[PDB]
Amino acid sequence: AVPKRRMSRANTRSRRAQWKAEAPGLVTVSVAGQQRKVPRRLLKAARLGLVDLD
């Protein structure tokens, strides 16, 4: 089908504000004497030397 009206500013921006993003929950790692912040999902793989840390 097809809309019928020019859906307003309020409604538009309101719903548009649901299309957002969340940030992964970060955690320290003692990468060879120094520290970097990495998700928890990848913690073991970092401590074992696979994660490409730039």
Partner 1 sequence: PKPTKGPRLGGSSSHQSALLANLATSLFEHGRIKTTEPKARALRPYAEKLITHAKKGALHNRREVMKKIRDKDVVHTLFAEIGPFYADRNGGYTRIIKVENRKGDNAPMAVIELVREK
Partner RNA sequence: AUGGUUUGGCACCUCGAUGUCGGCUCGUCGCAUCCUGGGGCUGGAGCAGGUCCCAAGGGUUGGGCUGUUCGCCCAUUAAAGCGGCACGCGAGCUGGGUUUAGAACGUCGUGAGACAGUUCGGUCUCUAUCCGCCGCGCGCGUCAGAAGCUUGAGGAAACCUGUCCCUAGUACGAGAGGACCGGGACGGACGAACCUCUGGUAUACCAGUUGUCCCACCAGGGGCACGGCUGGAUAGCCACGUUCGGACAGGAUAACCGCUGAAAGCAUCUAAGCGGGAAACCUCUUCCAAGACCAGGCUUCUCACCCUCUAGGAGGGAUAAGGCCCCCCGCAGACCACGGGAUUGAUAGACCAGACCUGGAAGCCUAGUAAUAGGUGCAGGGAACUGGCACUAACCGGCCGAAAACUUAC
Residues at the interface with RNA (CB under 7 A): 1-5, 7, 11, 24-28, 39-44
Nearer to partner 1, 15 or 41 (CB): 41
42 in Cβ contact with 51 (< 8 Å): yes
Apex 24 CA angle, 11 and 47, nearest 5: 170
φ and ψ at residue 39, rounded to 5 degrees:
-60, 165
* 26 counts as binding partner 1 under rule CB under 8 A: no
Interaction between residue 15 and partner 1 (CB under 8 A): no
- Binding residues (CB under 8 A) for partner 1: these are 41-42, 44-45, 48, 50-52
